[PDB]
Amino acid sequence: MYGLVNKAIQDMISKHHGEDTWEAIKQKAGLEDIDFFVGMEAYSDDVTYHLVGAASEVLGKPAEELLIAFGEYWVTYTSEEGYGELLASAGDSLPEFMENLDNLHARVGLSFPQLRPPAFECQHTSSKSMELHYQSTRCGLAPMVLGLLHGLGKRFQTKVEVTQTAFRETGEDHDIFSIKYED
Ligand code: HEM
Ligand SMILES: [Xe]
Ligand SMILES: [Xe]
Ligand SMILES: [Xe]
Numbered sequence: 001m002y003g004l005v006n007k008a009i010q011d012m013i014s015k016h017h018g019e020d021t022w023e024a025i026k027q028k029a030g031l032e033d034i035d036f037f038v039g040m041e042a043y044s045d046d047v048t049y050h051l052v053g054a055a056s057e058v059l060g061k062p063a064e065e066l067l068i069a070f071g072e073y074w075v076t077y078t079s080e081e082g083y084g085e086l087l088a089s090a091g092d093s094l095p096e097f098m099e100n101l102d103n104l105h106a107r108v109g110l111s112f113p114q115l116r117p118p119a120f121e122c123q124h125t126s127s128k129s130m131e132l133h134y135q136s137t138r139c140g141l142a143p144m145v146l147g148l149l150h151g152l153g154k155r156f157q158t159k160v161e162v163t164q165t166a167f168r169e170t171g172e173d174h175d176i177f178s179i180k181y182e183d
């Protein structure tokens with residue numbers, strides 16, 4: 001993934017647990033050689049997966065729990081680190097934002113030519129609910145989507161309940177989330 005993602009992981013861990021903890025995690029991920037992540041540079045997905053695993057071991061938390069926290073953090077991180085206007089242009093409510101998400105990544109894909117973005121499709125069930133279809137070239141990131149949606153809920157001051165109903169992991173075609181939102 002692009003270095004931006006790795007910078008954000010490093011940033012989250014450093015802020016919450018300090019530099020020493022970050023250094024340990026980086027060491028254990030086998031990335032001692034890397035002095036810093038370059039934001040607009042493409043890295044092997046392995047770099048990100050090794051960071052998550054090492055963080056899980058060092059911090060004593062399941063990787064999935066960390067993915068949730070990271071998904072939430074990313075919504076704030078992007079708005080403060082160069083993407084605030086891009087986010088604002090994707091709308092002012094949870095449902096409109098999720099509708100624009102493919103188009104937002106298309107725009108992101110202008111500047112990050114090698115992007116492999118997720119694909120998100122919305123089926124609205126009411127004015128307070130939707131089924132969200134999540135398709136990816138990558139495994140294991142559904143928990144991050146859950147945290148992202150909560151991050152978006154906080155962004156729009158909107159209560160959200162997210163329950164995963166299909167798992168690309170129990171053999172379903174792709175992840176599907178049922179979402180309830182009020183405000
Ligand atoms: C301005 C805001 C954002 C920017 C600049 C951005 C950029 C990126 C980048 C660089 C990646 C790495 C993909 C790669 O390197 O191939 C990514 C992946 C991803 N993004 Fe976005 N993103 C933004 C907002 C969001 C939001 C609000 C969501 C909410 C769902 C989201 C969902 C995801 C997911 C789930 C992935 C995992 C990639 C995958 O599934 O394969 N992003 N994004
Ligand atoms: Xe991300
Ligand atoms: Xe990630
Ligand atoms: Xe993480």
